[PDB]
Amino acid sequence: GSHMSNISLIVGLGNPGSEYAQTRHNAGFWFVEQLADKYGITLKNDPKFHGISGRGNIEGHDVRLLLPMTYMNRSGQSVVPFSKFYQIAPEAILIAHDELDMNPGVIRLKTGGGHGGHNGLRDIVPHIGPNFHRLRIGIGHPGSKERVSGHVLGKAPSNEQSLMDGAIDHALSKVKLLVQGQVPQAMNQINAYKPA
Ligand SMILES: Nc1ccn([C@@H]2O[C@H](CO)[C@@H](O)[C@@H]2O)c(=O)n1
């Protein structure tokens, strides 16, 4: 299975389909797809676990990537059985997701805590507990709670998209630390990112 807090499973949350691919709620997909491309990890169809998944080497470590294809609020129906089958403990899991409570261009590595109202995380924490790592990709908040669906299911304006893209790019460069178990250093160096 997994080994200590070397990250060996990286999950990106999002919704399937071209209609959702550019929406803010797919920030985790963006990160994992870009990471897969950087390291040459093939993301292939994985019907058994209701997702797309891959396995390959990141910096000398065997890592698995997962994009649930369940729709966001059923993400645990992919992540939980996958992690159980491969014997990956929460402490070895990184979940990338959009974060309403942070600005575009802000990114943070967090360990633990609740779902913060994120309905993908809400589907995962009850099963595996909170002690997985999160890459919180700021997307901003619409202001009101009745607007949250329109915000997360919206396509950001170009300035906000550029700010998210730069943050995601920065985080990609820090995955080496994570797969090596250097979570403190990764946290410091990811959380210090500024866009300008
Ligand atoms: N055909 C496409 C076009 C874009 N994207 C993703 O949407 C973000 C915003 O355009 C991009 O940053 C990101 O690539 C996608 O996944 N597939």
TrEMBL record:
One MF annotation (Gene Ontology) recorded for this entry = peptidyl-tRNA hydrolase activity
SUPFAM superfamilies per UniProt: Peptidyl-tRNA hydrolase-like
Q: Where is the signal peptide?
A: none
Q: Name one Pfam family in it.
A: Pept_tRNA_hydro
The keyword RNA-binding is annotated on this UniProt entry: yes
Keywords of the record, alphabetical order, are: Cytoplasm, Hydrolase, RNA-binding, tRNA-binding
EC no. given is 3.1.1.29
**Binding residues annotated for cytidine, in chain numbering:** N73, N119
Q: Where is the active site?
A: H25 (proton acceptor)
As for family, the record states:
Belongs to the PTH family.
State how it assembles. Monomer.
Give the protein's recorded name: Peptidyl-tRNA hydrolase
Origin organism is Acinetobacter baumannii (strain ATCC 19606 / DSM 30007 / JCM 6841 / CCUG 19606 / CIP 70.34 / NBRC 109757 / NCIMB 12457 / NCTC 12156 / 81)
Q: Which gene encodes it?
A: pth
